Design a protein around this ligand. Structure first.
Ligand code: CA
Ligand code: CA
Ligand code: CA
Length: 277
């Protein structure tokens, strides 16, 4: 639709670039002179996507491709837009004519209004591919003082890996194993800032321990190929030599309800000699 984001999925802490596009901007609406367009954007909670205030680029593109880049201000004048930011939301008002009644229009023909801006994904975002109103924003664009536009929505997305650690023979769930997560580019996950996934050295990696249920949950990752690296085996088990590949997104296995952003790899462990005896 008319509201889009730059990536199909994100990791927590990533910059999300949003684009709002409105292609029907002309000088009359009904028989009424258009003297402004109002763009209102209601974002998710800032605990989910935190708007970067002041990040806007506002343009008008005419039918020939000519671009006018607008600048911020309250004056009713060509080349301007007014901004109000409150509560993680914003409203942009673009004056369209020098006066409100019949001329003194600033722009001619059929124009496209584009607003680009950014936000930052935070820890409250929900993972997966389902209907997620909490991850969704809505932008409306209306002439003059109308509020009838039903708006354009987009949902930011991320993924989750639920690791289950078992004994390869008995299939029992095993507590106390320690893993780190590696990406496809040689780096290790540091998720110590709960609002920001980071990738770096192994020494700086976050260590995850399998719980009483054998599980580790890592929530808030971009699609891609990851590798589960065992740092400590459960008590009595041999340390696994090699990592286990886990795909999140296209190509995923072990999905929950066919959702390739909710994956459930099982890692098998091998009892060490003393434990079979
Ligand atoms: Ca130009
Ligand atoms: Ca109305
Ligand atoms: Ca980051």
């Amino acid at each position: 639709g008319g509201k889009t984001v730059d990536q199909k999925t994100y990791s927590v802490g990533d910059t999300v670039k949003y684009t709002i596009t409105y292609k029907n901007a002309v000088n009359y609406h009904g028989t009424e002179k258009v003297y402004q367009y109002v763009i209102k954007d209601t974002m998710p909670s800032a605990s989910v996507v935190d708007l970067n205030e002041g990040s806007y680029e506002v343009t008008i593109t005419d039918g020939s491709g000519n671009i006018t880049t607008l600048t911020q201000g309250s004056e009713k004048a060509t080349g301007k837009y007014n901004l109000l930011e409150e509560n993680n939301n914003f409203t942009i008002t673009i004056p369209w004519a020098a006066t409100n009644t019949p001329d003194d229009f600033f722009y001619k023909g059929i124009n496209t209004i584009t607003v680009t801006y950014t936000g930052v994904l935070k820890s409250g975002a929900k993972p997966g591919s389902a209907d997620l109103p909490e991850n969704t924003n809505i932008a409306t664009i209306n002439p003059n003082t109308s509020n009838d536009d039903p708006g354009q929505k987009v949902t930011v997305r991320d993924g989750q890996i639920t690791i289950k650690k078992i004994d390869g023979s008995t299939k029992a769930s095993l507590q106390g194993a320690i893993f780190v997560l590696k990406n496809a580019t040689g780096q290790f996950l540091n998720f110590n800032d709960t609002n920001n996934v980071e990738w770096g050295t192994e020494a700086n990696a976050t260590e995850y321990t399998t719980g009483a249920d054998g599980i580790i949950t890592i929530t808030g990752l971009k699609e891609g190929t990851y590798y589960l690296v065992e740092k400590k085996a459960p008590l009595g088990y041999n340390l696994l030599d090699n990592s286990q590949k886990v795909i999140l997104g296209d190509g995923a296995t072990d999905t929950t309800n066919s959702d390739n952003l909710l994956v459930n790899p099982t890692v098998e462990n091998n009892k060490g000699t003393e434990l079979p005896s």
